[PDB]
Amino acid sequence: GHKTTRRVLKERPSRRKGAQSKRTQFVRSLIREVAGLAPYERRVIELLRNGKDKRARKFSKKKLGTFGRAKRKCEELQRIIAESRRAH
């Protein structure tokens, strides 16, 4: 509509109000490795190790309720499997 010159605003500190810090990443991973896995998480781990990626994805979707959450959980479990393989 009207022609007005747009300004450049300062970056709000409320951006990224979730977590992205390396310290919280460390804490979260350490708590993962001290606490372990849930029954369904371990089931999906077994499925991924056996190679039934489709079955693991379906089970994760059934347990969680959302495709994005299922994909994400498969992702953390996959890097956990890879990290365990490297550690061994």
């Binding site: 390396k22 310290r23 460390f26 991973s29 350490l30 993962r32 490795e33 372990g36 077994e46 956990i80 990290e83 365990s84 490297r86 550690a87 061994h88």
Partner: protein, 50 residues
């Protein structure tokens, strides 16, 4: 399925060489204590007032 399996230290197997926080150390950790300075001053006030 083994019900109760041995834990694999996938994350803690790697020792981290460096501290987590990069926040600079404040001066109070290398200068004497102003808290005790103020306490000593208050005690001196009390002694002067008797």
């Amino acid at each position: 399925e083994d019900p109760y399996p041995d834990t694999v230290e996938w994350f803690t197997s790697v020792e981290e060489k460096m501290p987590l926080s990069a926040a600079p150390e404040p001066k109070r950790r290398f200068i004497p204590s102003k808290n005790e300075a103020k306490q000593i001053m208050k005690l001196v006030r009390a002694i002067r007032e008797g």
